[PDB]
Design a binder for this molecule. Structure first.
Ligand SMILES: CN(C)CCNC(=O)c1c(NC(=O)Cn2nc(C(F)(F)F)c3c2CCCC3)sc2c1CCCC2
Ligand SMILES: N[C@@H](CCC(=O)O)C(=O)O
Ligand SMILES: N[C@@H](CCC(=O)O)C(=O)O
Lengths: 263, 263
C-alpha cells in the first residue's frame, strides 16, 4: 500500500561514499558525497522513491560465516530485512546472487595489484614467485573469496601463502590496505579492485600504482532483497542511466576530474 | 512436466558462431564452432538440458519495427516463442530488457571504430568533423540505436550525417562492414562493437585497426523469453563460468590463440 522511505545500505569507500568535510554541520543524506551518493539520487528520481542513506553497521561488504552461516555486511543487511536496497561497490558473485537480487552492472572492475611506486612487481605471477614483498586482500568481500576458491595455479599459490602469512596480510578496510602499501617501503603489495586502485593512483601523495592486467572481469550491481518489487524498476533505471551516459559522467566526475597527480 | 530439447537461437558472427569448413559433412550442433558454440555447451551442461542450435532466420540481432511494432532477429524469436534461449553476442539494452530476460553479462564490450590501416582518424570526434571518410553501422542492432538515441553532441552530429548519407553507410552484416573497410581504400570507417573489432584486427589480411577508446561500456547477456524458468539456472551458470575463468579461457581460445597477425 502506502509508499515508504527506502532504507539504503552503503559503505564508506572512496570515492563511492565519503563524509563531506563539513558533515557534522549537516543532517541526513546531505552528510555524504560520492559516486554512489549521486547514483542513489538518480536511481531514486527514476524510480519515484524517497530514501534514507545509512552506512552498514559492521563496515563490511558481505560474507557468510562458515559455521553460523550468518551473512554480515551490506549483504546481511538485505538478507535480514534491515535495509531495502544496497547502492555501493558491491560485486556480483554466484553465492550472493543466490540470496539477493542484483541489477545489471553499473560499473565494471577486476581484481588488480597496487604497489608503492618502484616496487619490482609487474604481475600476480611475480608476486607468487617471491617472498620479500608481502601481499594480501580485504576481509569479508569478493577479492578474498576469489583467491580462496581459485583452482588457477598462480592464484592457488598466492592463496596458500596469504592464508598462513605472518603477520596477517589481510586488512579490514581499503584505507588500511592503502596505508600499508604507503607505509611499508615497497614491502607490501595490495590486491584490490581496479576501480579502487585507479582512484587511489590519482590521489596525493601520488605514491602508488596499478600494475599489470586485471586478474578477473566482473561488475558492481545494485542489490535488493530477493523478490523485492524494487528490483525491476531499479534494473531499468541502471540501464537507462547507462544508455544516457550518466554512469560515464559520474565516473569521470569522481575519478578523473578529481585527479590530483596530473592530467 | 517432461523436459524437452531446448531450441537455441544464435547468429553467424565471427568468432561466436561460424560454420566449420566441413559442415556439409556434419549434422546438428556439430556443424558450428565458436565462442557461443562452446558457451552453449557449458551452459547446457551446467543446467542439465539437451539443446538444438539454430541460426536466426532473418540474420538479425533484434529491433522493433516502429510502425508494425514487430520484433525481428533473435529478440523476435524469443518474443514470438520460436526459440527458448538466445546464446549469442546480444547486447543488453533497456528496450530489450523490457521484453526478454537477460543473464548477467558473459562478455563486456563498447562501440568502437574500425579503420583500414593508415586512415587519418583517431576518434569519433575526428570522424564527426569531416566528410571525406564515410562511416556507418550495422542495421537492426544496438549500435545503430545508440547513435539514433544519443543526446551527446559528437554522436548526434554523427547520427545526423549517417541517417542521410548517400550512398547508404549502413550494412546488413558485420562481414559486409568489414569488407567495405578493406575495399574502400581508407575512405570508409566502420562503427562496431570492440569485441568484434578486436577479433578482426587479429585476422589476415591484417589490414584493419581499432582506433581510440570505446564510445560506451556494456555487455552481452544470454536472453530467454520473459518469465522463462530457464532464466535463473542460466544466470547462475554464467556466474559460475565467469568465476571459474571459463569465460576468460573461451575468449583467449577464439580471439588470441586464433591470432593471425603476430604475438
Ligand atoms: C571472462 N570475461 C571474458 C567476461 C567478462 N564478464 C563480464 O563482462 C561481466 C560484467 N561486465 C560488465 O559489467 C560490463 N558491463 N555490462 C553492462 C550491461 F549492463 F550491459 F550488462 C554494463 C557494464 C559496465 C558499465 C555499465 C553497464 S559484470 C560481471 C561479469 C562476469 C560475471 C560477474 C559480474
Ligand atoms: N567490491 C567487493 C569489496 C572489495 C574487495 O573485495 O576487494 C565486494 O563486494 O566484496
Ligand atoms: N551486439 C549487437 C549487434 C552488433 C552491433 O549493433 O554492432 C546487438 O545485440 O544488437
Amino acid at each position: 500500500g502506502a509508499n515508504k522511505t527506502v532504507v539504503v545500505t552503503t559503505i564508506l569507500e572512496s570515492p563511492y561514499v565519503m563524509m563531506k568535510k563539513n558533515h557534522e554541520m549537516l543532517e541526513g543524506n546531505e552528510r555524504y558525497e560520492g559516486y554512489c551518493v549521486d547514483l542513489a539520487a538518480e536511481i531514486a528520481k527514476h524510480c519515484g522513491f524517497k530514501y534514507k542513506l545509512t552506512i552498514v553497521g559492521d563496515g563490511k561488504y558481505g560474507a557468510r560465516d562458515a559455521d553460523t552461516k550468518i551473512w554480515n555486511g551490506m549483504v546481511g543487511e538485505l538478507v535480514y530485512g534491515k535495509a531495502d536496497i544496497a547502492i555501493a561497490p558491491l560485486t556480483i558473485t554466484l553465492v550472493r546472487e543466490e540470496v539477493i537480487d542484483f541489477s545489471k552492472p553499473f560499473m565494471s572492475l577486476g581484481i588488480s595489484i597496487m604497489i608503492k611506486k618502484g616496487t619490482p612487481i609487474e604481475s600476480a605471477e611475480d608476486l607468487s614467485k617471491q617472498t620479500e614483498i608481502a601481499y594480501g586482500t580485504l576481509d569479508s568481500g569478493s577479492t578474498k573469496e576469489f583467491f580462496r576458491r581459485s583452482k588457477i595455479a598462480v592464484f592457488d599459490k598466492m592463496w596458500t601463502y596469504m592464508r598462513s602469512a605472518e603477520p596477517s596480510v589481510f586488512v579490514r578496510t581499503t584505507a588500511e590496505g592503502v596505508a600499508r602499501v604507503r607505509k611499508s617501503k615497497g614491502k607490501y603489495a595490495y590486491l584490490l579492485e581496479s576501480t579502487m586502485n585507479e582512484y587511489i593512483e590519482q590521489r596525493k601523495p601520488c605514491d602508488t600504482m596499478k600494475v599489470g592486467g586485471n586478474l578477473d572481469s566482473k561488475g558492481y550491481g545494485i542489490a535488493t532483497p530477493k523478490g523485492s518489487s524494487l528490483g525491476t524498476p531499479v534494473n531499468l533505471a541502471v540501464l537507462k542511466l547507462s544508455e544516457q551516459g550518466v554512469l560515464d559522467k559520474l565516473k569521470n566526475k569522481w575519478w578523473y576530474d578529481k585527479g590530483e597527480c596530473g592530467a
